[PDB]
């Protein structure tokens, strides 16, 4: 009932990993930070996926395949099994950088042998290897053809993590943009990179190259779980247009606010047990006198202005509105312009896909998607997940991409939900109208603080601060503190790790560019507090 | 802010009980039903509003200063179920008879004394009267045309009321030979011509307003920090908010009075109330148990400080339509806290609209709360032909999802329809075309909820059934496209369906 997966993290711990470039944390500390981030999510989220850890270039050989002189300086620190706190504690402080250097492809072979032996009996749905190296070490091209063949036959996916990104000044880890020294790369690193590129292309085609990340960017993304992320649970319905016309669909939640999975159980400070604490509800009169009111004598009531009318839950269930329970019923069609994004309601976005293994419904839905797209129109629909759920009215707009095709449902508001207030006009506020110098100062501010650059010459604007790619800092901050308390109970909570601040702040180039226009607008725009 | 005061003044002269248009209710019946409709609408839109019902031209006089022929049926007070029940005793022809029996009709009155009593009714209110309004329901276009003194004194007192701050609105009803404003009511009313039929305004008054509308509430007043030194103050307003079913109140079986609930936490071993210092929070993962104090659980929660932090300016094209997380907010400046905020806000709005770019910020609503990236989309002011602000000027705070909030998608094989099927779906869309309004649909659960409470309050056995607007007009749709529907169904679905 759950997506399982065998993950083997292959970390370079060689002396050169300890070799650090000024200002920048050593690739050893960078890889350690990324690995800890991954294991932390798998540990605290309690995923039933098994994780193994192989280190290459450590002093000595835990002989995982070292039948002779082969695969030296490779230690299998953790065999494929569910991750625990002992593993996190080992990563945090026990694992130290080694002095030797190993062949990253040899380490990849050790990882592959772990997957080949510990996955027996279709226990795992997905197989994945994550290599963490700097490529500064020399290597042999001897079994690359076999490595690729064994990876395909075993259906194992790869992911590479280097200190530099595929593409100077100060450098801040997790920041956007300058997150790797432009100069400093060795010809040995270039050669290793060319081999990495070829291997990724041989496994996942042209788009395989997108799976080669830098430690910095890896920290401000969820790409490390990409291959082991469990697919979202979809549910079926019928899009009913009128009478006689219908379409078998299956919709899932496209966007949904990810919240804390674990709940805080209240325990006693001394015993640390739930059993000792109990909450009892007491009834007392609303009136100045709080004599105890009998729990059984309490009757349900509702207010009708001044009057308070007693309406029991029994009569409520009978007299209440009974929903027809029909889901995704189409009410009508209107132009795209009539539905404004400001009226979107709810806490979810639904992606209405065509029922799986159904060709007639797939074409029936595709026809509507393309008809709405070509006419530049949308569909006003009635939706309810069950007869018990309150009915909703929302927008269903087309969404065609090169790979997939679907309709996107977003709940719209009811007359009662809408709120009409009157705000003072500013267009013609004689008192607040800004001068030409003030407007050209804001003009310089917006131009200097722009978060988008257009790649090539006229190509599409490349966004420099994609927030939708940055993970919610709540989770990795919580995992940091939870682990610190589990390992260091005597010590108080640690401060927010700097890379979290670096990933949340805009690229250094934007902050530096804004310096001058911000200083001009400070003097041009007078600010004083009201007291 | 304020509680609004509304006084319904009804004429009780002989002319009011004769209906003009045959087979039509008397102007009095129209008034009584209109008043009742307003009372019910008010028990939904705003319960704190104070209403009053005053009659004039009646033989029996009941009023503060004992002015002849003025019967104050209802003093200024909140709307109630029994007040509507009292008005229902005059609704209809039989109710008209009940009115003539309880109190007289067609008696000589004096509009000067009538407005004085109404003003004296506002005098006796203690709470903030935000709006003072009198709605005069009458079908006599020239009442004291015969008496010159009563007419001039009434004109003088009407001026005194407007100088007080009282609004005077006329609800002119059907009069033989038309209703003339120029003769009377033209100068008294607070600001057309001949209006022989009942004031059109009656259709709106008569129409029930089942809406839970609330006085403007700034949700929060935060600091918009452009930079460490540049900080303006802005107000965050929720212009759209899902209206939900009011929570029930726990009463008593006999007295039917509200009961206050106190949810107390105490020990099992000891039995006495436990202090919050003696409590700790725990989370157990497998075998390990992590212990954190309530303060520590909030300290990890702190993250960014409360306020808006300007990140930069992202072009609107980059903001995707499918990236909605939670309902958008409205950002407007708050000159009350920081003086000069509105000027910079106006300059920012103007230049953002010019450049078609949104202001990216790091939103932290309260202390010890993790931040969220929001995009302030420049919203321009829009005024209709009536000079009504259809879209206020400011920024729409659009919540952007984090990597966690974007859910992975189930990879499906792309199967594209033939141009014949899409052009044909185009024909269905073209035929089912309609005009969308933001206020087109009403919540059927709420509409039924308040219709049920109204009917139970009026002791009406039959509950008032709201027609569900959310259901599609199936039969109308089948009438508009029957054959086309069978044709496409034939084109895409084969007869051996699953």
């Amino acid at each position: 009932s759950g997506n399982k997966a065998a993950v083997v993290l292959c970390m370079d711990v060689g002396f050169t990993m300890s070799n650090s470039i000024p200002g920048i944390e050593s690739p050893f500390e960078q890889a350690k930070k990324v690995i800890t981030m991954f294991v932390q999510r798998q540990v605290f989220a309690e995923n039933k996926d098994e994780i193994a850890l192989v280190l290459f270039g450590t002093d000595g050989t835990d002989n995982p395949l070292s039948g002779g002189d082969q695969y030296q300086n490779i230690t299998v620190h953790r065999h494929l099994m569910l991750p625990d706190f002992d593993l996190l504690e080992d990563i945090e402080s026990k694992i130290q950088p080694g002095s030797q250097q190993a062949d990253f492809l040899d380490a990849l072979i050790v990882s592959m042998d772990v997957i080949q032996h510990e996955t027996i009996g279709k226990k795992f749905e997905k197989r994945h290897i994550e290599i963490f190296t700097d490529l500064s070490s020399r290597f042999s091209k001897s079994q690359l053809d076999i490595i690729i063949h064994s990876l395909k036959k075993c259906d194992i996916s790869l992911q590479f993590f280097l200190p530099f990104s595929l593409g100077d000044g100060p450098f801040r880890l997790g920041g956007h943009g300058p997150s790797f020294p432009l100069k400093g790369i060795t010809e040995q690193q270039k050669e290793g990179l060319e081999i990495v590129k070829m291997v990724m292309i041989s496994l996942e085609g042209e788009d395989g190259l997108d799976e080669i990340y830098s430690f910095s960017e890896s920290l401000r993304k969820l790409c490390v779980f990409k291959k082991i992320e469990r697919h979202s649970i979809h549910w079926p319905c019928r899009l009913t247009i009128g009478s006689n016309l219908s379409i078998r669909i299956a919709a899932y939640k496209s966007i949904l606010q990810e919240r804390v999975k674990k709940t805080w159980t209240v325990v006693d400070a001394k015993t640390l047990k739930k059993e000792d604490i109990q909450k009892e509800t007491v009834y007392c009169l609303n009136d100045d006198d709080e004599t105890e009111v009998l729990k059984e004598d309490i009757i349900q009531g509702f207010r009708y202005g001044s009057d308070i009318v007693p309406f029991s839950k029994v009569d409520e269930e009978q007299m209440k509105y009974k929903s027809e329970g029909k889901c995704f019923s189409v009410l009508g069609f209107c132009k795209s312009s009539q539905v404004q994004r400001r009226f979107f309601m709810g806490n979810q976005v639904l992606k209405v896909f065509a029922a799986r293994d159904d060709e007639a419904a797939a074409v029936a839905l595709s026809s509507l998607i393309h008809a709405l797209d070509d006419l530049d129109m949308v569909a006003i629909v009635r939706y309810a997940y069950d007869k018990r759920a309150n009915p909703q009215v929302g927008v269903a707009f087309p969404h065609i991409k090169h790979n997939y095709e679907c309709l996107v449902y977003v709940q719209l508001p009811f007359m009662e939900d809408l709120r009409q207030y009157m705000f003072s006009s500013l267009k013609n506020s004689k008192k607040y109208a800004p001068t030409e110098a003030q407007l050209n100062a804001v003009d310089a501010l917006i131009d200097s603080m722009s978060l988008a650059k257009k790649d090539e010459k006229t190509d599409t604007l490349e966004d420099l601060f994609p927030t939708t790619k940055i993970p919610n800092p709540r989770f990795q901050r919580l995992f940091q503190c939870l682990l610190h308390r589990a390992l260091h109970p005597r010590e108080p909570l640690p401060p927010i790790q700097q890379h979290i601040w670096n990933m949340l702040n805009p690229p250094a180039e934007v902050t530096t560019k804004s310096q001058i226009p911000l200083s001009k607008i400070k003097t041009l725009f007078p600010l004083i507090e009201a007291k | 802010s304020g509680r609004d005061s509304l006084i319904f003044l009804v004429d009780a002269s002989k002319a009011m009980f004769e209906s003009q248009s045959e087979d039509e209710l008397t102007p009095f019946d129209m008034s009584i039903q209109c008043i009742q409709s307003v009372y019910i609408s008010k028990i939904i839109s705003s319960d704190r509003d104070l209403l009053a019902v005053v009659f004039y031209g009646t033989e029996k006089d009941k009023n503060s200063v004992n002015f002849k022929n003025i019967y104050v049926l209802q003093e200024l007070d909140n709307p109630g179920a029994k007040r509507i029940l009292e008005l229902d005793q005059f609704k209809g022809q039989q109710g008209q008879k009940r009115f003539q029996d309880m109190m007289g009709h067609g008696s000589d009155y004096s509009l000067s004394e009538v407005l004085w009593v109404c003003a004296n009714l506002f005098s006796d209110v203690q709470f903030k009267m935000s709006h003072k309004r009198i709605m005069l329901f009458t079908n006599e276009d020239n009442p004291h045309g015969n008496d010159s003194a009563k007419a001039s004194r009434a004109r003088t007192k009407a001026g005194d009321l407007r100088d007080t701050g009282i609004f005077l609105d006329l609800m002119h009803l059907k009069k033989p030979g038309g209703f003339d404003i120029s003769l009377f009511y033209r100068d008294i009313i607070s600001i057309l011509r001949v209006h022989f039929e009942e004031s059109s305004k009656l259709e709106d008054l008569l129409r029930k307003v089942r809406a839970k509308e609330t006085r403007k509430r700034a949700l929060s007043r935060l600091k918009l920090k452009l930079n460490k030194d540049i900080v303006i103050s802005v107000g965050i307003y929720n212009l759209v908010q899902k209206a939900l079913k009011p929570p029930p109140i726990k009463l008593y079986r006999e007295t039917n009075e509200p009961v206050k609930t106190k949810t107390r936490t105490f020990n099992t071993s000891t039995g006495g109330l436990l202090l919050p210092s003696d409590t700790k929070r725990s989370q157990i993962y497998g075998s390990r148990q992590i212990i954190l104090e309530k303060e520590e659980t909030e300290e990890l929660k702190r993250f960014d400080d409360p306020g808006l932090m300007l990140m930069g300016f992202k072009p609107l094209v980059l903001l995707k339509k499918h990236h909605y997380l939670r309902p958008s907010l409205f950002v407007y400046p708050e000159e009350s806290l920081v003086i000069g905020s509105s000027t910079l806000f106006s300059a920012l709005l103007i230049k953002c609209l010019e450049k078609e770019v949104a202001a990216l910020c790091r939103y932290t609503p309260r202390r010890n709360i993790p931040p969220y990236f929001v995009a302030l989309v420049p919203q321009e002011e829009e005024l209709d032909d009536q000079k009504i602000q259809v879209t206020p000027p400011g920024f729409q705070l659009v919540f952007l999802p984090f990597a966690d909030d974007k859910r992975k998608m189930p990879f499906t094989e792309k199967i594209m329809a033939t141009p014949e099927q899409v052009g044909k779906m185009k024909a269905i869309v073209e035929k089912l075309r309609f005009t969308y309004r933001s206020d087109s649909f009403e919540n059927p659960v709420l509409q039924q909820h308040f219709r049920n409470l109204e009917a139970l309050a009026l002791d009406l056995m039959e509950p008032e059934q709201a027609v569900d607007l959310t259901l599609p007009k199936v039969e109308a749709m089948n009438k508009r496209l029957g054959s086309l529907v069978d044709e496409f169904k034939e084109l895409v679905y084969p007869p051996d369906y699953n």
Binding site: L331, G332, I380, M415, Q420, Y421, M422, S424, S425 | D4, L6, V38, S41, K42, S45, S46, S130, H131, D204, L205, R207, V209, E213, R215, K216, Q386, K387, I388, E430, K431, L432, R433, F434, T435, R437, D439, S440, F441, E442, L469, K473, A476, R480
Partner: peptide, 28 residues
Amino acid sequence: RRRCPGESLINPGFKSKKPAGGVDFDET
């Protein structure tokens, strides 16, 4: 400051609106 109810009718500062809609069809 500025405080015009305008076309708010019974609820000042609150625009009044038609309750109907959803079945008005243009005849293509």
